[PDB]
Design a protein around this ligand. Structure first.
Ligand code: NA
Length: 300
């Protein structure tokens, strides 16, 4: 429609699972690319604590699904930097058991890694899920200050890249000092402008995101009016889109990166050759992978 001027189908251009070049021997490649996603990532999660010698602390920032699993190696100092991952799933699915592919190589490079969970729609309106996420940001800074670690990196995939993007507009929580602690913000294949997808029964069935004409501003990072930009000048921001996403996905990332840059943040856009929306996460469990080396390079 808008981010894809060649568009025919929107229910296809808003489900990344259709733009994969993988599983093409299959009648429904999309179902295949999800089955695979769910399976391998759960495998990655069990392997962390059953074969990799990594330790996990089970914490929470709130009731029920509002959990933080903190992964570390005991051979490494407790004042290690902290890497925070915010998972995807269209605000309707995905959980901790599928969110920990990224942990292993980072722990092996000397990070502590916090992998968080959140409540889904429609248990919350997206709008509420977002005030809950604000509580998680307060919790994670409260927690790092406790351990007097003063270097953090945040990464969010997909709907989690969208949820993460509020860190730049919650200054009553994220002080200038807190901002100063952040080395990088990484936004993997997110959505930033919800205006289109809001009116779809395939993405938003029976309006479970609880959106409407009045809160569309609020839930669209694309549309905000950024202030107090200079306090983020120590933080590098990387908006990433995968080569084989939807065209809509890719351009949203590209424009968000532009919005960010024009407003004067240190942001860049990347189009990541060979990846789709999903294997771009799957492969974070492999230290040698392309995406791994990308995260490594952010450090210099
Ligand atoms: Na540190």
């Amino acid at each position: 429609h808008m981010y894809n001027p060649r568009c025919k189908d929107l229910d296809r251009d808003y489900f990344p699972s259709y733009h994969t070049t993988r599983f093409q021997d299959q009648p429904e490649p999309n179902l295949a690319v999800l089955e695979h996603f769910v399976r391998v990532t759960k495998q990655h999660g069990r392997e962390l604590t059953e074969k990799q010698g990594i330790t996990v602390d089970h914490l929470r920032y709130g009731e029920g699904r509002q959990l933080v699993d903190v992964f570390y190696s005991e051979k490494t100092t407790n004042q290690a930097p902290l890497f925070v991952f915010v998972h995807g799933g269209y605000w309707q699915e995905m959980d901790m058991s599928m969110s920990c592919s990224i942990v292993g190589p980072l722990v092996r490079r000397g990070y502590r890694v916090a992998v968080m969970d959140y409540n889904l729609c429609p248990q919350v309106t997206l709008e509420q899920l977002m005030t809950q996420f604000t509580h998680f940001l307060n919790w994670i800074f409260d927690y790092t200050e406790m351990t007097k670690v003063s270097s953090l990196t945040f990464a969010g995939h997909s709907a989690g890249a969208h949820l993460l993007a509020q860190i730049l507009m919650r200054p009553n929580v994220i002080t200038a000092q807190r901002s100063k602690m952040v080395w990088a913000l990484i936004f993997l294949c997110g959505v930033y402008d919800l205006r289109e997808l809001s009116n779809l029964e395939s993405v938003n069935p029976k309006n479970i995101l609880g959106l409407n004409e009045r809160n569309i501003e609020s839930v669209s990072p694309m549309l905000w009016e950024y202030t107090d930009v200079t306090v983020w000048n120590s933080t590098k921001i990387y908006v990433v889109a995968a080569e084989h996403d939807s065209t809509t996905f890719i351009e949203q990332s590209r424009h968000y990166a532009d919005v960010l840059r024009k407003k004067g943040y240190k942001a860049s856009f990347t189009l990541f050759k060979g990846y789709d929306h999903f294997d771009i996460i799957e492969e974070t469990a492999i230290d040698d992978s392309d995406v791994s080396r990308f995260l490594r390079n952010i450090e210099i």
